[PDB]
Design a protein around this ligand. Sequence first.
Ligand SMILES: [Cl-]
Ligand SMILES: [Cl-]
Ligand SMILES: [Cl-]
Ligand SMILES: [Cl-]
Ligand SMILES: [Cl-]
Ligand SMILES: [Cl-]
Lengths: 339, 339, 339, 339, 339, 339
Amino acid sequence: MRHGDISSSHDTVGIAVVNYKMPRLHTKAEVIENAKKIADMVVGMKQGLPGMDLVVFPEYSTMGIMYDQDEMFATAASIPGEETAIFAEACKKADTWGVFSLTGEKHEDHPNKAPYNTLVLINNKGEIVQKYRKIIPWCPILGWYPGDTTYVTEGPKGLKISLIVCDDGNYPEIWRDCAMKGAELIVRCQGYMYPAKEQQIMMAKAMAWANNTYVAVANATGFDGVYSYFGHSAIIGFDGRTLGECGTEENGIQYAEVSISQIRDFRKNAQSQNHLFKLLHRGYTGLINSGEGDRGVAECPFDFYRTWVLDAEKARENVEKITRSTVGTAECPIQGIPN
Amino acid sequence: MRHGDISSSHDTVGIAVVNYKMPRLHTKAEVIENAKKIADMVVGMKQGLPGMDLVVFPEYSTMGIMYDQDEMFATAASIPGEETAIFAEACKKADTWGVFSLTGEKHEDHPNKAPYNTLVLINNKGEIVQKYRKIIPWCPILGWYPGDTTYVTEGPKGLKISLIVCDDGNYPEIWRDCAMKGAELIVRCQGYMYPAKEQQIMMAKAMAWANNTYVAVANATGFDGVYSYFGHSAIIGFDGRTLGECGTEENGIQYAEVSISQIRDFRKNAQSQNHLFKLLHRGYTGLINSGEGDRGVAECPFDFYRTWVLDAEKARENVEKITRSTVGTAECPIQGIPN
Amino acid sequence: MRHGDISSSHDTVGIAVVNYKMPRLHTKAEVIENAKKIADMVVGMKQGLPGMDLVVFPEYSTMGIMYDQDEMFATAASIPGEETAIFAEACKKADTWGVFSLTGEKHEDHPNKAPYNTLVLINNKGEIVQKYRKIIPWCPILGWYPGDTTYVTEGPKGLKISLIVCDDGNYPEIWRDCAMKGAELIVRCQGYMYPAKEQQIMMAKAMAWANNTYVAVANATGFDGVYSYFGHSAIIGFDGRTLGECGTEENGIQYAEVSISQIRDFRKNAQSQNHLFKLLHRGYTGLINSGEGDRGVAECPFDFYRTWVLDAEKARENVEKITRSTVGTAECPIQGIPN
Amino acid sequence: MRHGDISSSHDTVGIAVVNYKMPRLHTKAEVIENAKKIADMVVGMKQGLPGMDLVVFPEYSTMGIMYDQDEMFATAASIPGEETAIFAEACKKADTWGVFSLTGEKHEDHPNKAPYNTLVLINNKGEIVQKYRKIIPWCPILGWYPGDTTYVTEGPKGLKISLIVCDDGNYPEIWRDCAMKGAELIVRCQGYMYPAKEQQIMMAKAMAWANNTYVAVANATGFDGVYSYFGHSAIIGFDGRTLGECGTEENGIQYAEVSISQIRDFRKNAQSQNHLFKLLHRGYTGLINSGEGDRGVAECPFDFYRTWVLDAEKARENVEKITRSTVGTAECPIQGIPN
Amino acid sequence: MRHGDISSSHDTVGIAVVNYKMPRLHTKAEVIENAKKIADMVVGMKQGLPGMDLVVFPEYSTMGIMYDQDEMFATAASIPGEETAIFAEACKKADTWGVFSLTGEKHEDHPNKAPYNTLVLINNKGEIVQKYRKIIPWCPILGWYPGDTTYVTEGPKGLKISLIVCDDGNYPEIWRDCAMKGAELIVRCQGYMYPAKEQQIMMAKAMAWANNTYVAVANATGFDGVYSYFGHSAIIGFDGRTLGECGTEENGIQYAEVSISQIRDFRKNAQSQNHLFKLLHRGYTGLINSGEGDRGVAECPFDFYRTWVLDAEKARENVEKITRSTVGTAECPIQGIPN
Amino acid sequence: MRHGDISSSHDTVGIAVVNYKMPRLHTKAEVIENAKKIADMVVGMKQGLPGMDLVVFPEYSTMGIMYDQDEMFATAASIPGEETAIFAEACKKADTWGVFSLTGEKHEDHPNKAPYNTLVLINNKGEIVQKYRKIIPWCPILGWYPGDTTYVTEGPKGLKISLIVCDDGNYPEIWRDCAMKGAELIVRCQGYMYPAKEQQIMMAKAMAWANNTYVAVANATGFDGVYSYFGHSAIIGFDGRTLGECGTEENGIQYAEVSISQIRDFRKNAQSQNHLFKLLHRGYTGLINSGEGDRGVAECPFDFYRTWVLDAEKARENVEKITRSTVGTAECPIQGIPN
Ligand SMILES: [Cl-]
Ligand SMILES: [Cl-]
Ligand SMILES: [Cl-]
Ligand SMILES: [Cl-]
Ligand SMILES: [Cl-]
Ligand SMILES: [Cl-]
């Protein structure tokens, strides 16, 4: 967990995040060509950053956003596929792992159902070792099919990695779920448009802190005809302190080294702010001192989570009373979203 | 949700938070005397802040921290009790609601079990309308008995309020639980010692954002013989933007007006960042466009929460593999905490 | 007054400001083509921002700055004219109001006198409902003819709007004049070049505060051969708090919702910082308590304003004693500016 | 205009501002005693700050706020008087000028009318050379009689000084009036209570910028039984850049040197941001280039100021339509303020 | 190098810095009593911070500043002495090392020569293991005798420590000298008065960065009759990033853990920003590629340092041409300083 | 030392720094063409900035970085040469001095040895008046030959100027050396790639402060195939306060006026923070008061500098014990760098 150098050591994983300029594309050939610009960018960056072990690109960075449904279906990728092969070759040539975005990934029932929004982790041998499909799409505007699972994978030098996408990160539950599965780095790939700039920068830091985990964020830049993307790609320590952060600049890069031993030492030895530990041993000093065992309490005291797990439909109904009953609102109508 | 004025309107609740100087006390009489200084402070503040409807004091602000176990047991309060009556009279005289700290509140099995760490909400008639016992004590150092329940209560002008204490706030689950029960303001009362200053200031904003809720934080100041407390009491909008924030100054005050209609309008009409709504309707545009109903998906996709609710002991065991097996660590031993 | 979402409600006006890349143009045809890129940008933005009711572009965003006098005269627009018609069609198609820049607008005595520097407000039916000519040109460098009047117009959902241009905003008098005419949003369109970046960002916030008014600022970006423009387009609450702010990025966008009811409630019910009210009822508590009526004092106690209104030439003479007597200075001479 | 050193030169005036802890006093004797603590503080500060030429104390720093009307009348000062003599002796002994607060200053019709809220500038010979009575009292809460005039006085080393008080500074008109009378330093003495902290810090900088003038602010600290005061005393350059700023600390001090030659050079030679000059020569390049003289335009184009000067009652009536008709509001009633 | 927790591990040294309130003292007995308040504070802090291995107090924190020469001579300490014994006992009882200030330390020719300004490092057995006398006193105002040597000592867990005092830190040479002697933590103890607040906070970070070293700063707070002290005690990583920082609050505390292995790994493996290494191997890639050996260049290319070492009097003469010839200046005269 | 205006006076030097977009070039013709774009940019900027006396471009701004050794050798410049003549003509036409980058400058033994990395200062007559070759190349990645000398030259209006390059600035020694030779402005030209953004911005301010000197920094922007450059070109006062700073934007410009008389007044009259003076008169008040002369002490008390000057090889050996023995590290190997 240290920032400023271009090197990395046997204890540290050199992570680069890219403020990749959002493409405005329409055909399969254009996608392939942009895939190759990414590949070239990986190989070039490696020459300047000899310590780079992991390079991260934004959500949508391969296809752009395919606003047109037909173009969406026509460019949807197979995984593995030609785009992933282009990326795999760059990771091999540059001896780095990478995180890349396929939007869309063909549904099992393509073209009858919406594609997924997917990330892949590719290792330095070129193999796909995690495939993550976005669990919470950025509705209403965006129409991908929801995924249903998080993953943790052994990454470079053994660092445990989970991937999440953009809007997923707004929900503390997903970062918790990944850290509780043992993630040591959560990578959040986004195509995060203005308005919500200061709140997203803050949310990555607050989630790093709350879950005692390293966080890397790669966010898109530029204007694509519809949205403008605010950059601020960043790498954050497990103590919630920023390592380095880009500004809004197109094809900005940040680079930091995260220590494997530091996060393991901390998760073993921290006490007051060992949040993963504390959550499942509540009140331990109190119970010891009251003669009731030395484990604290583990039981979940939060009715919302008890209800959500037992009766998802009742949790939904409860939220609808606080918010609204239909996915759309007549005060700000959107075509194909009912109100 | 607006800051700068000392007034309040029929739509807005005037909230004051107090950077109360941490007391260093030892006897019941000293506690009573300090209770009366708080009462006087409420009545004085009301003369300068005619819009104040809710005043908030820090965790420990009535007793200080009773580091000595015997003094702890000897000063533990009854609720209702003499301290609460002193506070109630101030709220009546000043025509304000208030939030006050009793640390400890006698256990049902006093003095055989550790006291609770408790907050009360008192209305402007002087009645106790919520009593909250801290669910996650700041172990290892602090030895209160854990509570087990959150609450939502109708507050001034109908604003829905939940109370949480200090270390509770480090855990996104509790803010979620309160907002999902319908809280519109979460009040976090703390005696938050250095070191973790910048991370706690940030966590309140990030939780306001993530849960679309107003947040008020009152934190202690000064040095009490053991800890120094960093202040930065604050009131935050439901959009994650700070309304006003104190510095580290002793007996600093901040004051802001929060709109009842604004938060209700937003929870009804917001779309992209209606996080309470979205969490329980995932992928709605995707499913509509794939011919699968117009509700999105509600089911909980996060294994950690499924496990925690079904098998708390397995969740505990899983965390212990990532962290450590005993509540204490031999690398930083603490008396009465095993390792 | 809330930030983060892409929606708007019946109470809120969705405002988008654009960090539009400064064009470098020379002919009428080039102007028309760039007018059409703006039009396309409006229509695209609306697809991503369903709540947008008002879109704002920078000063000079249609023509760029015409540094060459002949090109200036040759591209000067008629209002209404072909450029305004292009904009009007976009506002209709996207169902939004907009603010656009014509620099220059032909003088009544074109081409014998310098053109105006003008803004138009176009409604969602495509009609021009306010035309504002810049009252204080950015002399010495820029050579437009000065306008002489501010305006207030009913805007989207009834929000009252006034327009001002760049250098105008450096003068607190103009923001006051607009707010005192009843403006609820002042829109400041600028092509604000480096150096003065931090002072202009601050001045918009301080004027929002001082005049209890919403402010939107759209500022240009990029380098145009002469100047570099620093962006930081922003939307600010009437309490002086930023809603959202761009960085320096080309074609950045910010978006925020401003509440109609919130600003009306405040102007009716605020007391200590009701600055519009207070300025014309000075010392009201003092006079009441001294037996002298319950209105305070309204009379203007400031000699400068009394003099400026009665004897503009004497005010000028007075300033020249404090500054200098000629428009130019021999220590930094500029061609055609005498010293 | 330079910060960091404790020295001053023949070109620079050494200014110290004091975050003076707000007193809580009740009798004339207590006032006298606190006057003497201020005097001692001046003399001590001079030993550490050999360059100090001007020392500034907050509004209310001599009496505190006399919330009780009888105590108000009983402690009201004569000017000159015993309190001023105590201050005068310190300025002589320390060879410094100073700015001190008398709240109240007996009305000409004492005790039949409310006292003024007054500042004095005392020179290094001990003579009172400016007496300023607050033009805009902080109504509703505070009940002083309004003054009606600003002043400019020759200060240390010839630096021209004007004094203003707290709430006055919220109104850009007063800073303009002072600068247009030739002020080179405006001193703002305040007892500025929370809430409005960030807006007041910003307003001093924005007024320094807008009026091309040095600004010094001394603000009170601590809690006085009613209000908490937020400090942040500061000295600001004429270019709007902070020289140095205190935090919220009790009896904090800041010290900076302001250059006499720098501000005179600037007011003579600045061009684009010579705001005092520009306001009264609008459109000069435009008129020259349109064949209409080389002076620009001086006439006041702002209807609000024309109306306020000609018909103060009509300006009042106009504001009341935008705000409210009575000084008080029934939604937040205050005793003795009608609604 | 991680912040937020109260623990420490076998790899990390728990450092606490104290914003100690500046005493205003006059006799030996008062000094002894304040020495005992420090001792009590160490022991109390240890109960809240079980990981604390090193506690740091500000310059002057034991005596205050003895402005009166006779009181200076009368309270000057012997080292070892009664004050050091009081501190030693606290370090033993709390099992911590500490850094304490003796101002003055009797000169070898006491009372015929000015005392030193001295820091001691005391280990957890109570032994004094480093004594540092300030090399660059804060002239003109302060009159201590200059020391002439820096030191590096093995500290807790083997972390190498050097001590420096206040004004010393303004000079990059001293931090370099300590790091080049092998220091891994430089501790800067200060009684750093306003004005220069933002520049000193920045200088500690910039020196941490430039010398690849951990830095801890303890600075005094409050007002002592002469000066006000601005706090902002801090602990900084070797990468220049702040771990934690106090505000201006009296008796504020910060606490952070610095890793022994992290700084050793970095000094061994960093490349682009291994500044200690690079300075003495300049141009290594260039020389290798030009066929001239693989060591780069070590020779000192800076004439100032060559001159200062060879001919200190010529270096002095050279500086006097750029600045002034006498220690005092007639434009700001100070008694006993000639001009 | 003042910011905001586009003018300059007989006392002030108008400095512009350029966030020049890093070129990606391969041949001599491409270099010449880009040289001409710089020339055009100088002439255009002058039309908008009539006060500009000095314009500064980043390191590498003429050639880009020539990553390929053959292209490096093929484009290496002669000085004077065709590129310098292109720049000289622009400085004449625009009546400005300028700072330009030649990377590489042919070695005396070209093409047998690596080129230098060089800056030139060109006056407003077009003459080269300083040529500086980088003393500390950014090894390992970059392979220029090291220079060995700093220079001070009379600049516009007599302001004394020294030039330094990028990585040089990480070493406080070089800024000291220049200021001690009499530099009043140090110009740092960089092609400073991410990661180290916040540390470099801070280092320029801290060096301005520590050496009582004006600083101008021009840094590159964009992505060049290998690195991304972070901009933040800036001009800083001698008191360490930023005048103006760019963001990350491509071809951003900042402009500020630095006063000749202000820095001379300060270096003559400052006392507590006259760091150039103090370093060579240590302990002056102490010695005077101890009867030992009125000059303080000049001798160098820092063993590292004594050793480095006397025995560079021993200084090297000493550093290698703290860091490592070879220029390369096997944990992060780089081709042609041994380990
Ligand atoms: Cl999505
Ligand atoms: Cl607790
Ligand atoms: Cl203009
Ligand atoms: Cl008042
Ligand atoms: Cl000293
Ligand atoms: Cl280099």
